Every structure is written in C-alpha cells, then in structure tokens.
Structure 1
Amino acid sequence: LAKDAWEIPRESLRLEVKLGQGCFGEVWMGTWNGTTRVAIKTLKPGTMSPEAFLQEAQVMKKLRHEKLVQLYAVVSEEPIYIVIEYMSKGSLLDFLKGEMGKYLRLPQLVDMAAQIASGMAYVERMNYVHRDLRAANILVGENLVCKVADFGLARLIEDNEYTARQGAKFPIKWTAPEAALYGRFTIKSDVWSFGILLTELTTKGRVPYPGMVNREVLDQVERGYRMPCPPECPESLHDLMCQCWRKDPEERPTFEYLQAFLEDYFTSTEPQYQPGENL
C-alpha cells in the first residue's frame, strides 16, 4: 500500500510492443519519459495480489548489479506496472535454441556462464536466494551480455535458510532435491540450479534429464544418478556441474568460486582447447 520514490506517473510510459504473456500478466517493450526504451511487466487484474506482484519490484530495489536486470520504476496503482531494463535479445533459452545459438562455441558459452555466475555471486554476497535460476530466466542483451532476471521468488535469507510455505510447488528438474522435497532454500540450492543451467548452455537449450519424468528424476537422483557429460563438452566442465550437484549442499561450491573458475577456464583448466562442430 505504501509508496516511495520509485513511483512514477503512468502517463510517463507508452506501451508499444507486446513481448510476452503469462497467467499473471504481460511484458511490453515501451518508451519511458518519451526518451528511454524499457520493458514493462503488467499485472493482470484479479490473478495475483498487487502486494504479491510487487514483491518482485521490492527485491529489485535492493539488488543492483551489472549482471542483474535493473529496476527503473513502479506504478503502484491499478493497473500495476513494473518498469525495467530492456534486454533486446530476449530469453537465453530461446536465444540458445534459435539460429544464433548454432554459431556459439564453448568460449562464448563459458563467458555467458561467467556473467551469470557474477550476477549470482552478487546475490550470494547480499544474502538472497533466487529460487528460479535457469536459462528461461536469464535475459540476453547486445554483444552476448547475460543478466539474471525474474526475481518474483527471490527472498532475503534469515537463519541460513528460506523455508518454503506449505503448498508451494517447484519444478523438480531445475530445483535442488532438498528444496523441492523439504522446502529448504539456500544459496546452495541456487548453486545446484546453476549446474543445471550449465547443461542448458552446453546443449544449447535441451531439457535436463531428457526422456525422464519428474518422479523418476527424484528417485534416480537420490540413488546418485547425475546427468552425464554432454556431447562435445569437456569433462572438466561436467566435473564442475557434478560439484554443483553434490548431495550435501554445503559441499557445493560458492558462486564466488564458480565465477572465478569460469573466467579463467581457458587458461587454468583447458589451455589446449579447440572448437569442434558444436562446442
């Protein structure tokens, strides 16, 4: 209900092109103050609470970093608008599976991973957990700039864990087992998700655990199953994914480590790498 200095007059926005639609509203490209290109997320009336919808803006007010999609402004009166940084190339997932993805090779994909890791290391430093980290929630700008987006589920961590409320449901294939099963969300469950995201990058958008169903993934993963090394992917990178997928969350690497490892990958880890047909 309470407003602050993020508020702007709706008249200062013009919605020009529809970029997407979901069960809770739409995303439009537009112009702000008749001069700035922006993205605008709208709230579909009577689908979600205004206060619930704006929690996402609240999180963004706090998390500011070159590798996170930036909040610009809010319209807190119905219809609710969240005005954010425009990412011209859209979703990483769609980018990877389209024509452009075909031309990408490992050095580029690893740099994209490193940028994402950079954003997440910031999230890590700030004591937040994202909870929805995956290629569909990464946005791509010019020159292969990648930023983490969609902070709807993000929460500030108190007591080392965010415990999910009863009834909450999360996508099994992209979520750490302890979070999906017991509701235990920590930065370490994000690290697990980052590992899944690495498979999305190296397969250029393939679904994780291909062919397997949710209950089977849950079952096999508990038994120790892990996705094998993707085709043409160096084993050292898959080794990194397996580290992200350790059963004990505290044994999973920090994003600080992940960022450094990926930044230095071709010097420290794979000095003699050469590009193949796909990676």
Structure 2
Amino acid sequence: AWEIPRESLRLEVKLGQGCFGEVWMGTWNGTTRVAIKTLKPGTMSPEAFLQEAQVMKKLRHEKLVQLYAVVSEEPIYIVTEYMSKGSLLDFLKGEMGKYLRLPQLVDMAAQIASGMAYVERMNYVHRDLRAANILVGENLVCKVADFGLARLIEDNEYTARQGAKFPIKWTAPEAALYGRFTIKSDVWSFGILLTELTTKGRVPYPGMVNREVLDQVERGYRMPCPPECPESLHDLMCQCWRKDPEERPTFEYLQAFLEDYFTSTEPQYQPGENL
C-alpha cells in the first residue's frame, strides 16, 4: 500500500526541522532523488496515517508536492518529491525576500491557488495552508506540501486547537473555534498567505495574541492593507476573510484573478521600495 522498507531510503542531507519532525534530502532505491519527512513518535497513529496516505497518493498535480511512498512504522517517514529552495516562509524572510516584488509574489500566489484549485476540484481539504507549508524550487516555482497531515495530529494542546503548535493566526474562525475545516477555511488561510507574501514573511496580526485575534476577528476586525500593496489585492484578502464561509471565493477564482492581475486589474503598477 505504497509502503516501503525503511532501508530502501538513504537520508543524506538535513533540509529543515519543525514543530513535528524533520526533513531530509535523500535517495530512494539507490536511484531516485527524494525528500524524506520524519515524524516524531507519538504524533499520529500509524494506521490512521497509512489510511490517509492512500488519499494523499491520489493528489497528482504540478503545484502539489507529490507523495511517492511511506514508512508507516514509527518514526513515520513520508517520501516525497524534493524541492530545492526550502519553505516559502524562510524564502520570504531570507536574502531572496528582498529581491521579490509584487509580480513575483502574485505569481507565487497564483501557483499556490492552482494547486489548491485541484484540491478543491477533488473535494479535499488541506487544513494547514500557510507559507511554512509551501515549498519553493528553481525559477520561483511554488508547490503546496503536507496535505492531509493536520487532521491526524494527536498532540494534546494541538487537538484542543490551542498552544504554540496550533496556527490560530492562520486559521479561519470557524475552523479554529469549532474544528469546522473545509475548502472554505483553506480559502481564509490563503487570504492570510497573501498577507505573508506581501509582508515578506511577517507574522499575521503583529502585536496581537491568539485570543485577541479570535475575539477581534469575530467582531469584524480584519488585517489592513500592507504598505505598497494595491487596495485591489487587499480586497481579495478581505473576500477570503468573509465571515460566511460560503461567500468566500473559490480557489478556481483566486487562481484566475491572480494570473490576470497585471492586465485585468493593476496594469498601472509601478515598482516600489518593497513591492
């Protein structure tokens, strides 16, 4: 069931570490370049994971990081397509961040929307869309990673949607408060992602704590338009942040709006200091 022997993998170079595990560049079957994500034991049920992996395997799209194989025994290994430029969040915060302007950032958003539009077409739900879980490759290619993992995490505080490991600031209120995760809560998160892109990786709701964010957002608060960001793009964010989930745009719409942005919407764009 896409399950492979652990010894068919060679984990060669460390690529990163996060709240729930590490990731390595390596070789599969001594011939194939891959990445291997490795999960801290106790993070999720091997059986529940193996079941979900069968779904993850079916998601085949140029803008989704492809699943190749798994090792379901703890520590769980997830074997995927390898992307050479790291997480989008780190990309935005690092040295290249200074060279990115609105046209690059909008194109990256359009690519992400394209992968998510496939997820949407397939009637699936990501649950944790944000720059930390997007990967960058050569030629500023961006792909969505880690589809289907969020639901499986068993961390104590995390299952209560609280604590340092649960991304409250990136999560739609109905999902954060009530666990109502849908493609429309993914759309909200995409709105937050647009803010990450236009602020070069700044945390959302700067200076606000998690509870304050939830309270304020429920009362109608929305993040403002970033400096040098056209109001039309902030309007798109605000559509993603509509209180009624059904009234948020589709990813199909987001993709097309972003792909056409500089001819249909902002043909008069002039580069600024940052965007």
TM-score, normalized by length of structure 1?
Answer: 0.89
Distance 1:158 1:92, change over 3 A: closer
1:253 maps to 2:252? no
Structure 1's 269 and 165: CA in aligned 2 closer, same or farther, altered over 3 A? closer
Q: Distance in 1 between matches of 2:269 and 2:197?
A: 17
Note the alpha carbon deviations across 1:139-182, whole angstroms, 9 max, x for none.
11111110111124467999999999999994221111111112
Query: Is 2:153–2:159's contact at 8 Å kept on the other side of the alignment?
Result: no
SS at match of 2:26: strand
1:27-69 Cα deviation digits (max 9, x unpaired):
1111122222110122344453322444553332121111001
Q: Residue 45 of structure 2 contacts residue 152 of structure 2 at CA under 8 Å; is this kept in 1?
A: no
Structure 1 120/274 Cα, relative in aligned 2: closer, same or farther at 3 Å? same
Assess if the C-alpha contact under 8 Å between 1:55 and 1:152 holds in 2: no
Structure 1 residues 208 and 165 mapped into 2: Cα distance closer, same or farther (>3 Å)?
Answer: closer
The 2-side partners of 1:183 and 1:79 are apart by 27
Distance 2:8 2:152 in 1: 31
Q: How many residues align?
A: 275
Q: Judging changes above 3 Å, is the alpha-carbon distance between structure 1 residues 154 and 126 closer, same or farther for their aligned structure 2 residues?
A: farther
Counterpart contact for 2:61–2:118, Cα < 8 Å:
yes
Change (3 A) 1:48 1:22: farther
Q: Which moved more, 1:260-269 or 1:52-61?
A: 52-61
Decide whether the 8 Å contact of 2:133 with 2:144 is kept in 1. yes
- Is the 1:161–1:186 Cα contact (8 Å) retained in structure 2? no
Change (3 A) 1:10 1:74: same
Q: CA deviation at 1:207?
A: 0.6
State the SS of the aligned residue for 1:123.
helix
Distance 1:126 1:157, change over 3 A: farther
Compute the displacement of 1:73 (Å).
1.5
Structure 2: gaps (5+ residues)? none
What CA RMSD, in Å, does the superposition of the two structures yield over aligned residues?
4.0
Looking at structure 2, the residues matched to 167 and 109 of structure 1 have their Cα atoms a distance apart, in angstroms, of 30
Taking a change above 3 Å as real, the CA distance of residues 14 and 235 of structure 1, as seen in their structure-2 partners, is same
SS in 2 for 1:47: coil
Could you state the TM-score of these two structures normalised by the residue count of structure 2?
0.90
Percent of matched pairs sharing the same residue: 100
Task: Provide the C-alpha distance between the structure 2 equivalents of 1:45 and 1:211, rounded to a whole number of angstroms.
Answer: 34
